[PDB]
């Protein structure tokens, strides 16, 4: 039983215990929440054990278990540098997501925990599978649990939201499936170790690129294909929102490393000016739009759109710096956007019952712990240094500028507007007068739970912001394998 | 701790002592009215309120200025405003 298969098995045992413990003890709801939390903790503990044993400079997939009982659809698991940190981010985030809803579900708690635990197994399976069809099977398997999570525990407009996220993702994924099936037909197999060895013809690469890019653009999302995010990420329960923004957005980013950079390098090189136009447009249009967004979670949801454009531009830079920056920005956005949704969807929305920004003012006066963390998360969302958000933005933007300067400059302008919308929101909530006259009751400050799910998130971004080498050390050799090009005097040694 | 009635009356009384349009300094008292006791025109009362506002370093809104038709009313307005210096 490989460590990687252990990762997928623990959350399934937790589901079993959650749904059977009543036959051994009316069981208290606190029991279910404790089973689910410990389950995610042991999954985090296993992912940390794997990371200690992980080797930073191996071109072999590590911790793979030999199957040799070949079938039509077999599940092979393996990990290298590009997948190791996405696996860690999934295992760190999900316990925080569980605590972020400890008190705010209050109904169908068994269903919420089983759905949350199942989502962990599926999302981890996405980052661990060593086959392109296996990748697709898990990328899509999460829609029905996502569809039912929003509908069971979402806000007032959760019906329109759940439909939007289901149908957008399916429609785009159906175009990715067509591209994937063409690959398996030509090659005979979708296993990574032998599909990357193959060489597709240019026009095949061109049509393979559109099919895959249409799906990755719905999931980034790119601007104009992002209606589903505006609805789903806001109407979802807080735990759903954290998982949706901090893990699910990353699948398309990790999928660019496994599905287009190795097999479609000519198409990627010849179409970067189209990816960059869409990437540049998304940086500006989203930034201007979130400046005028009045729902606090939708403002924070809309920020994810702007940052996802920056690491989408990085992965197509064909440079070592852009690709490392893209993973580091995708990781950084995972912590910071998780904290900002806890601040908005968890702290403000539980106190007031509303998310309109018009009703908030001067919260610093009564809530100095919320404002202290909120400001640090508003700095991190603005790409301020000593946050992992700056190291990722600077490396991602440097690659974008070097690959194509006109897009780099425009994507650079995000340094202004991210700051602009992040600080403007911060002032209309924490500063900007005395406590809002709409509040009749006074508000309490962060509970111990709220303090420690924020302190944990702001610790990860800051420590990684001062020493990003912890992550870059395990990306240097694997990131190198996805670069496409040669130097005049280093190529073809004899 | 702030401004007391005794201090406000002295500043106000010494302010009107320098005004020629006032009939005499001896008619000034607590319940004095600018209109009939000190005999001031509508324009003179506007001058008096501006002098009071400059002396106490406060800005009086037009609606409040209309309310101040008496020396006692002025003393009460100064006491009501915390900002008065």
């Amino acid at each position: 039983m490989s460590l990687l298969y252990v990762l997928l098995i623990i959350p399934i045992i937790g589901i079993f215990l959650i749904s059977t413990i009543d036959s051994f003890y009316f069981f208290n709801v606190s029991y279910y929440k404790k089973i689910a939390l410990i389950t995610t903790i042991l999954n985090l503990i296993v992912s940390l054990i794997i990371y200690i044993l992980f080797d930073f400079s191996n071109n072999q997939f590590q911790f793979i278990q030999e199957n040799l009982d070949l079938s039509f659809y077999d599940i092979y698991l393996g990990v290298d540098g590009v997948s190791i940190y996405f696996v860690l981010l999934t295992t760190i985030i999900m316990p925080i997501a569980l605590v972020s809803n400890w008190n705010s579900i209050t109904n169908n708690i068994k269903s919420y925990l089983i759905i949350m635990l199942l989502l962990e197994t599926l999302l981890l399976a996405v980052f661990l599978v060593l086959d392109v069809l296996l990748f697709y099977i898990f990328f899509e398997s999460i829609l029905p649990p996502l569809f039912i999570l929003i509908g069971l525990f979402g806000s007032s407009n959760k019906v329109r939201a759940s439909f939007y996220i289901f149908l957008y993702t399916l429609l785009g994924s159906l175009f990715l499936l067509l591209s994937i099936l063409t690959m398996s037909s030509i090659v005979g197999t979708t296993y990574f170790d032998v599909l990357l060895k193959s060489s597709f013809e240019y026009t095949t690469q061109l049509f393979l690129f559109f099919g895959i890019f249409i799906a990755f653009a719905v999931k980034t999302p790119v601007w104009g294909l992002n209606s589903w995010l505006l609805r789903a990420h806001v109407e979802s329960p807080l735990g759903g929102s954290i998982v949706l923004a901090a893990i699910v957005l990353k699948l398309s980013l990790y999928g660019v490393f496994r599905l287009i950079l190795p097999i479609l390098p000519q198409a990627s090189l010849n179409l970067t000016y189209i990816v960059y136009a869409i990437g540049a447009i998304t940086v500006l249009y989203a930034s201007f739009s979130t400046l005028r967004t009045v729902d606090v979670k939708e403002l924070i949801a809309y920020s994810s759109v702007a940052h996802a454009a920056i690491y989408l531009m990085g992965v197509f830079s064909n440079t070592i710096q852009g690709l490392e920056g893209a993973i580091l920005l995708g990781l950084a956005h995972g912590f910071v956007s998780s904290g900002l949704f806890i601040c908005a969807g968890g702290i403000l929305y539980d106190r007031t019952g509303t998310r309109l920004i018009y009703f908030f003012r001067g919260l610093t006066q009564i809530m100095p712990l919320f404002s202290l963390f909120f400001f640090i998360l508003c700095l991190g969302n603005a790409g301020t240094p000593l946050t992992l958000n700056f190291v990722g933005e600077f490396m991602s933007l440097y690659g974008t500028l070097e690959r194509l300067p006109i897009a780099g400059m425009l994507a650079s302008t995000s340094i202004i507007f991210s700051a602009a919308y992040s600080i403007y929101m911060y002032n209309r909530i924490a500063f900007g007068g005395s406590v809002s006259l709409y509040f009749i009751d006074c508000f309490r400050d962060l509970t111990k739970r709220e303090f420690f799910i924020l302190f944990t998130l702001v610790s990860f971004t800051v420590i990684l912001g001062i020493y990003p080498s912890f992550v870059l050390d395990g990306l240097h050799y694997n990131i190198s394998s996805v670069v496409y090009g040669i130097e005049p005097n280093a190529s073809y040694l004899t | 701790e702030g401004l007391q009635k005794v201090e406000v009356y002295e500043r106000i009384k010494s302010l009107l002592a320098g005004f020629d349009k006032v009939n005499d300094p001896n008619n000034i008292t607590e319940t004095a009215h600018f209109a009939n006791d000190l005999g001031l025109d509508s324009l003179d009362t506007v001058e008096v309120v501006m002098a009071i506002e400059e002396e106490f370093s406060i800005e009086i809104p037009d609606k409040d200025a209309d309310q101040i038709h008496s020396v006692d009313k002025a003393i009460e307005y100064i006491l009501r405003q915390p900002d008065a210096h």
Partner: protein, 75 residues
């Protein structure tokens, strides 16, 4: 109002009405001269302009280790 009891807010009817109008605004969009031009400016022209500049200047320069007597122009 929600599942978990919150604090008592002075839920202003005017602000509530404003936040509902925004959430429902998509249902009332219509194609007119104005709405067609704006939607054509943002979606087609400005993106196609950037795509033109990105396409035209892809590979035009390299800054790496450039010296005096050697240009930045690459094409």
């Amino acid at each position: 109002m929600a599942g978990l009891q919150h604090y008592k807010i002075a839920m202003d009817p005017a602000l509530v009405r404003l936040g509902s109008m925004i959430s429902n605004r998509y249902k009332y969009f219509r194609w007119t001269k104005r709405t067609a031009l704006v939607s054509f400016m943002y979606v087609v022209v400005v993106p196609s302009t950037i795509g033109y500049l990105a396409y035209k200047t892809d590979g035009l320069w390299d800054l790496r280790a450039k010296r005096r007597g050697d240009l930045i122009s690459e094409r």
